[PDB]
C-alpha cells in the first residue's frame, strides 16, 4: 500500500503525528515528551517500525511524518532508504521531516554525517539535530516538533505546508 | 618414556574387560538355552507317542 | 620445617582477614583457647607472624596445611577454571556397593604405583560429595605444593569435575585413577568448560528449572505493529522459559560452511571461521535480544541449546 | 438458580481431585503436555514428594524433573515409556518408595539410638549399604 | 453462563482421562475434621467408595496431623476397608494384612496388579475357549482359576491347568502354573517309558522355553 496525504477528511481541532524508527524506546520517550505539555488542540500520536502499514480502515489521516535516523547503526539507515520508497510524490511538499539521533558522541558514529546529508537534500526536506538520550535536549526537541505539526495541521491561518517548505530551505 | 607405556597398557586391559564378561553371560545362558530346549522336545515327543 | 611454615604463611596472606575467623574455627587445628589470644584489632602483618608463631610452637605437618587450602579452595571455588568427566559402566555389571575406605585406599594405591612423590589429601563433605586435593611429583623431584589439583567427585554418579591447573601432562593417569577406584570402565571428557561451579552443577544434574505444576496509560498513543511485538514476546518466553538462567560467561562455535549468497559462486571450498560470545552473564543478554530488535523473533537452535544438550564448544561442517 | 448448582459441582469436583491426590500418584493437565506428582510414605509416615513433566506429542520425550540423579531412571525411562506408561509410572513408585523407606530408617536410627552406637555409621547415597559396631548394656 | 460451562466441561474431561490413566474411578468422599490442642494436634477422618474397573471398595480412615514448628508429622491411626464377598480368599488375606499394616498405597498397587493378571487370565482361558472348542472344557467358566481339556473321543482322559495368582507377604503379586492329570493307570501298564511323573517340571521347563499360549496350543495339537 501507499500512503497518501488526503484521504480522509480532517477531524475537529485534532492533530495526527506519526513517527518511524527503529528503537522503541527512544520513540516512546519523544511521544511522552511531545504529549507531557499542554496546547489548543488535540494531539494524537502514532509509532510505526516501518513501512508500508499495516492494512487499517479506522486509522485518520496523517499530517505530518517523521523519519528518526540513528547515526550508530547501518540498520536504521537501511531501514529509513527502505520505507522510503513506500510514499508518494504529493506527500514531500514540506510535511515530511528527518530526525538524527547520536551526534554528539562522535567516537560511537558509524554513518557520515555528510551521508544523510544528500539524503535530506535529495527529497528536500529539513534536517534536524538531537541527542533523545537528554531529557533538557529532548523537551525542547518535542517542543519544536509540536509547533511544527501544528503549522502543518492548518491550525495557523496565513501560513500552510507549502511556505513552511520554502521557509525552512538551505541556500544550498 | 615408560609412564605413557603405563596408561595404554590399562587402557587396553579396561576396555578389554567388559567384551570378556559380555561373552561369558552370552555362552553360559545360550549352554542352557540349548539343554532346556532339547529336553523339552524330548518330552513333548514321548507324551505325544504315549497319547498315539 | 621452613617449607611447611612458608606454606601456611602464604596460605594464611591469601585469606582475607574479615572471614579469618571463620576459616580458622573450621580449620579446627589449633586449640580453641589459642584463638582469643590473638587480637585480630592490630595489622594483618602482626596476626600472621603471631599465628605463625603459634602454629610453629605447636607440631604441625603438612596434612594440616593441605586440609586448610582445601578448606580455602571450597570457600572460594571461583579463582580457578573447572572442567567435567562424564564416566561410563557395562551393562552387564550390577549396582556398585560404594564405599569410602575402599575407594580411598584405591585411589591412593594408583598413584602410589604409578608414580613415586605424590601428596593426597581427602575431604568428605555434605550432599555426598568428596574433594580431593593433589600434589603432583615424580621419583626425581620433591611434590610441588605451588601447583596443586583439585577434584570433586559425587558419589553413585557418573560425573566428576576438575579443576584445570596442572593435570595437562597427567590427565590420562588422573582419568584412569578415577574410572579404576569408582569401578568403572569407560571415560570422557564433555565440552563444558565454566569458572562457576554452581553452574555446572545445575546444568550437568538438569535441575536448574523447578516450575511444577499441580493441584495441592495515555490513550492517546497508538501502538501499531503490537501484533508482532506480541507475537514476538510469545516466542520468547516459550523458547527462553521463565525459570531464572544458570550463569555462564563463554562460548565457542567453529564453523566450515560454504559460502552461498554473483559472489564467490565458483568456490566450492568453505569458509572457515571462529566466533566467540563473551558476557559477564551469559543466556540473560541473549534472552532480551529479540524484544530489543537485534535479532529475529526465533533465535538460532545453536544459541537456544547451550542448557539442553550441555555444551559450551561447537563444531559445525556442511 | 444455575449459579447454586454450577457451584456445588466445582467444589465436588475439586474434592474428588484432592482425594486422588491422596491416593499416592496425582496428575494435572498442562499445554505441553502432563505433569505427575509422586508421593513416598512408609508405615504411615508421609514423606517428601517429587514431580515429573512428559510431553505429549510422539515420540514422547522428557521434559524436567526432580528425582535425585542417583536413581536409574534413565533405563527403566528407556525401555519403558514407549508403552504401557501406568506400569512405569508404578515402577517408578516403587523405587521411590523403597528409597525413601530406607532413608526413614537410616536416619532415625541416627537420631534416636545415638547411645547405643559408638561411632557414626558408613552410609552410601542410594542407603543400600550400612556397617556399623554397636555396644549395648 | 457459556464460560461457567466450559470451565465444568473441561474439569470433567480432566476427570475422565485421570481416571482412564490412573486405571482408578472413585466415588463420594466425606472429610471431618476435630481439633484436640494441648504443637497442635487435628484429627482428620477420611471416607470414599470406589472401584477399579472390575471391583469395587469402600474405605475409611482417619490421620493424625501433628503440626510443631519444625515438623509435620502424619501418621495413618486407624483404617478400615471393605470388598463385595467374592470367592478370592487370598484377597481377604491381603486386605487383612493391611488393615493390620495401616498403608495405603501399596494396597492400590498390588489391587492394580491384581486386577492386571486377571484380566490377562481371564482373555486367555476364553480365547483358547473358542479357539478349539472341540477339545476344551472349561468346566468352571473364565472367571476362574481351572481350565478343563479333555478330548470328546474318550471323556476318560482329561487334565487340568490351574493357574494362580498370589501375593508375598512384602506386597508383590506373581502368578504359577501347574497341571494336574486324570490318568487311569491303563496308560501306566500300556507305556514303561514312565513319561508321565516327570509332567510338572517338564511343562514348567516348556512354559519358559517359548510362551504361555504356545505351550497350551502344543499340548492341544498333541492331544488331538
Known amino acids: ?172 | ?52 | ?318 | ?137 | 453462563s457459556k464460560d461457567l460451562k466450559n470451565q465444568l466441561g473441561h474439569l470433567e474431561s480432566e476427570l475422565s482421562f485421570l481416571s482412564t490413566l490412573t486405571g482408578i474411578n472413585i466415588r463420594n468422599h466425606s472429610k471431618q475434621t476435630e481439633d484436640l490442642t494441648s504443637i497442635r494436634k487435628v484429627l482428620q477422618r477420611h471416607r470414599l467408595s470406589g472401584n477399579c474397573h472390575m471391583v469395587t471398595f469402600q474405605l475409611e480412615f482417619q490421620i493424625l496431623e501433628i503440626q510443631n514448628k519444625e515438623r509435620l508429622s502424619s501418621a495413618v491411626t486407624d483404617l478400615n476397608i471393605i470388598m463385595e464377598p467374592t470367592e478370592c480368599s487370598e484377597l481377604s488375606e491381603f486386605v487383612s494384612r493391611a488393615e493390620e499394616r495401616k498403608d495405603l498405597f501399596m494396597f492400590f498397587r498390588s489391587l492394580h496388579f491384581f486386577v492386571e493378571w486377571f484380566e490377562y487370565r481371564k482373555r486367555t482361558f476364553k480365547h483358547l475357549k473358542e479357539k478349539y472348542p472341540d477339545a476344551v472344557y472349561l468346566s468352571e467358566g473364565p472367571s476362574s482359576c481351572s481350565m478343563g481339556i479333555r478330548s470328546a473321543s474318550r471323556p476318560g482322559f482329561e487334565l487340568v491347568i490351574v493357574w494362580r495368582i498370589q501375593i508375598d507377604e512384602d506386597g508383590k503379586v506373581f502368578p504359577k502354573l501347574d497341571l494336574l492329570t486324570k490318568v487311569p493307570q491303563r496308560a501306566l501298564e500300556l507305556d514303561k517309558n514312565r513319561a508321565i511323573e516327570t509332567a510338572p517340571l517338564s511343562f514348567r521347563t516348556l512354559v519358559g522355553l517359548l510362551g504361555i499360549e504356545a505351550a497350551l496350543e502344543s499340548l492341544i495339537k498333541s492331544l488331538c
Open chain 2, 1 to 52: 618414556k615408560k609412564r605413557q607405556r603405563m596408561i595404554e597398557v590399562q587402557d587396553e586391559l579396561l576396555r578389554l574387560e567388559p567384551q570378556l564378561k559380555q561373552l561369558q553371560t552370552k555362552y553360559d545362558e545360550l549352554k542352557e538355552r540349548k539343554s532346556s530346549l532339547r529336553n523339552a522336545a524330548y518330552f513333548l515327543s514321548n507324551l505325544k507317542q504315549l497319547y498315539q
Open chain 3, 1 to 318: 620445617d621452613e617449607t611447611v611454615a612458608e606454606f601456611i604463611k602464604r596460605t594464611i596472606l591469601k585469606i582475607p582477614m574479615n572471614e579469618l575467623t571463620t576459616i580458622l574455627k573450621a580449620w579446627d587445628f589449633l586449640s580453641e583457647n589459642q584463638l582469643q589470644t590473638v587480637n585480630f584489632r592490630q595489622r594483618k602483618e602482626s596476626v600472621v607472624q603471631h599465628l605463625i608463631h603459634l602454629c610453629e610452637e605447636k607440631r604441625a605437618s603438612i596434612s594440616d596445611a593441605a586440609l586448610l587450602d582445601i578448606i580455602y579452595m571450597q570457600f572460594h571455588q571461583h579463582q580457578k577454571v573447572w572442567e567435567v568427566f562424564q564416566m561410563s559402566k557395562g551393562p552387564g555389571e550390577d549396582v556398585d556397593l560404594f564405599d569410602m575406605k575402599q575407594f580411598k585406599n584405591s585411589f591412593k594405591k594408583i598413584l602410589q604405583r604409578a608414580l613415586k612423590n605424590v601428596t593426597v589429601s581427602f575431604r568428605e563433605t555434605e550432599e555426598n560429595a568428596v574433594w580431593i586435593r593433589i600434589a603432583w611429583g615424580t621419583q626425581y623431584t620433591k611434590p610441588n605444593q605451588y601447583k596443586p589439583t583439585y577434584v570433586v567427585y559425587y558419589s553413585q554418579t557418573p560425573y566428576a569435575f576438575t579443576s584445570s591447573s596442572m593435570l595437562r601432562r597427567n590427565t590420562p593417569l588422573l582419568g584412569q585413577a578415577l574410572t579404576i577406584a569408582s569401578k568403572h570402565h569407560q571415560i570422557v571428557k564433555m565440552d563444558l568448560r565454566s569458572r562457576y561451579l554452581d553452574s555446572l552443577k545445575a546444568i550437568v544434574f538438569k535441575q536448574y528449572n523447578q516450575t511444577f505444576e499441580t493441584h495441592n496509560m495515555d490513550s492517546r498513543i497508538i501502538h501499531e505493529n503490537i501484533v508482532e511485538k506480541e507475537r514476538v514476546q510469545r516466542i520468547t518466553q516459550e523458547t527462553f522459559g521463565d525459570y531464572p538462567q544458570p550463569q555462564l560467561e563463554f562460548a565457542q562455535y567453529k564453523l566450515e560452511t560454504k559460502f552461498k549468497s554473483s559472489i564467490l559462486a565458483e568456490r566450492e571450498e568453505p569458509l572457515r571461521c571462529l566466533i566467540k560470545f563473551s558476557s559477564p552473564h551469559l543466556l540473560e543478554a541473549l534472552k532480551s535480544l529479540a524484544p530489543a530488535g537485534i535479532a529475529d523473533a526465533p533465535l538460532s537452535p545453536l544459541l537456544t541449546c547451550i542448557p539442553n544438550k550441555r555444551m559450551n564448544y561447537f563444531k559445525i561442517r556442511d
Open chain 1, 1 to 172: 500500500s501507499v500512503l497518501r496525504p488526503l484521504d480522509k477528511l480532517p477531524g475537529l481541532n485534532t492533530a495526527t503525528i506519526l513517527l518511524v524508527g527503529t528503537e522503541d524506546a527512544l520513540l516512546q520517550q519523544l511521544a511522552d515528551s511531545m504529549l507531557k505539555e499542554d496546547c489548543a488542540s488535540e494531539l494524537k500520536v502514532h509509532l510505526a517500525k516501518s513501512l508500508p502499514l499495516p492494512s487499517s480502515v479506522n486509522r485518520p489521516r496523517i499530517d505530518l511524518i517523521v523519519f528518526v535516523v540513528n547515526l550508530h547503526s547501518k540498520y536504521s539507515l537501511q531501514n529509513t532508504e527502505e520505507s522510503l520508497r513506500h510514499v508518494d510524490a504529493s506527500f514531500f511538499l514540506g510535511k515530511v521531516c528527518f530526525l538524527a539521533t547520536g551526534a554528539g558522541r562522535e567516537s560511537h558514529c558509524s554513518i557520515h554525517r555528510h551521508t544523510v546529508v544528500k539524503l535530506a537534500h535529495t527529497y528536500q526536506s529539513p534536517l534536524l539535530y538531537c541527542d533523545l538520550e537528554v531529557e533538557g535536549f529532548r523537551a525542547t526537541m518535542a517542543q519544536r516538533l509540536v509547533r511544527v505539526l501544528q503549522i502543518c495541521a492548518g491550525h495557523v491561518p496565513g501560513v500552510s505546508a507549502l511556505n513552511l517548505l520554502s521557509l525552512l530551505r538551505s541556500s544550498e
Open chain 4, 1 to 137: 438458580n444455575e449459579q447454586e448448582a454450577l457451584e456445588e459441582k466445582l467444589e465436588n469436583v475439586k474434592a474428588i481431585l484432592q482425594a486422588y491426590h491422596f491416593t499416592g500418584l496425582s496428575g494435572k493437565l498442562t499445554s505441553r503436555g502432563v505433569c505427575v506428582c509422586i508421593s513416598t510414605a512408609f508405615e504411615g509416615n508421609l514423606l517428601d514428594s517429587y514431580f515429573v513433566d512428559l510431553v505429549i506429542q510422539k515420540p514422547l520425550r522428557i521434559h524436567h524433573h526432580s528425582v535425585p540423579v542417583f536413581i536409574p531412571l534413565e533405563e527403566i525411562a528407556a525401555k519403558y515409556l514407549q508403552t504401557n506408561i501406568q506400569h512405569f509410572l508404578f515402577s517408578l513408585c516403587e523405587y521411590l518408595n523403597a528409597y525413601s523407606g530406607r532413608k526413614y530408617q537410616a536416619d532415625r536410627l541416627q537420631s534416636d539410638f545415638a547411645a547405643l552406637l559408638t561411632g557414626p555409621l558408613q552410609r552410601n547415597p542410594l542407603c543400600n549399604l550400612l556397617s556399623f559396631t554397636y555396644k549395648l548394656d
